[PDB]
Symmetry: D2
């Protein structure tokens, strides 16, 4: 199944933050309406924040997280969770290797802000 794709309310500001847990340098691209809106990269085996930004979901509401290492797309896992019918988390993990820890790049999207 498709992973790392989320439908947000239109024209809504959301937060996106990425962490790294890998010997490989991670590249995280955040797409809004199929176009790269933010790119984060870095390397850490200690959950270092490799990027954070506030973006706008625009008129499509379509937000996609892609993770790549040495040009090769990582395998993604994702889900959305809503707390008290108000607070949204869109969560992404990724695997770049063979140990299947799925934490090599971790991405957290949250809304609403403000």
């Amino acid at each position: 199944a498709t992973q790392g794709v989320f439908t947000l309310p239109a024209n809504t500001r959301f937060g996106v933050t990425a962490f790294a847990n890998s010997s490989n340098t991670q590249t995280v691209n955040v797409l809004v309406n199929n176009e790269t809106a933010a790119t984060f990269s870095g390397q850490s085996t200690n959950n270092a924040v490799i990027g954070t930004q506030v973006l706008n979901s625009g008129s499509s509401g379509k937000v996609q997280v892609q993770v790549s290492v040495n040009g090769r797309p990582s395998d993604l896992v994702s889900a959305q969770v809503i707390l008290t019918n108000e607070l949204n988390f869109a969560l992404v993990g990724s695997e770049d290797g063979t140990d299947n820890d799925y934490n090599d790049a971790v991405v957290v999207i949250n809304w609403p802000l403000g």
Copy 2:
């Protein structure tokens, strides 16, 4: 029901990261085995990463998040989600006022690391 309390695997490294979305300065306390292990603070209405830290879950694995605004405890909402039976997120939202957006301090705990 109790919120912001999570049982992690014992003696395990986890990341804890806090975001602020309020006019009030937020104070986030992270307790490990009922003792304060980290404290983050900041003020933003634009999802500032007011703190992030790697901690060890200790002997019991009990991790608790508490949020306050100048000594006044905020109301908490929380859940844990596990992706591909491997990647864990413990999620916390909090409300310091009356608009019930529950984003005033958002806390994300993730494991495993490395």
Copy 3:
């Protein structure tokens, strides 16, 4: 925080299923737009299905689950999860006693159907 309240897409069919794990008979009310849409009653300490019903979210999209024993409201916990940006679960637990297992009546709402 308010629990057991969910916003569904308008005019959408959804399934609601209730399980019992308590010595007390559980009374489960499902409200749609603040009015009774379904009521289940049953007792089991072995996860028996005490009700299942296909409902329509109608014009409001507001769905609320209430659980009580002899008219006294149980404490609720709830969250919504979305898989592959398509499949929705609205989940509810309830506690009618002191042991805090939160399973006394468990309610699962799922959509889309068909």
Copy 4:
């Protein structure tokens, strides 16, 4: 990533319940410690509970859900959620066609029981 596989605590009672939403007959097999422990079959486009059962996770705690339509495995999506650090749901969706509603067989595992 692997989907539909969950590690439960060893020797724990759990409920498993399968719903059908497809023109095709669904077969749901539930494996514990790699051995079929329950099997449900049925066709519905109205969220019929094609089976529910109570099982024990045994010494391994390994539970796997498989879904097939006349001998072809459906594509699975899954996640586990925990509310108030106590109530667990292991959730499975599956797709047997092209529309990607991922509801063709839906399986919900819940614990604790009693």
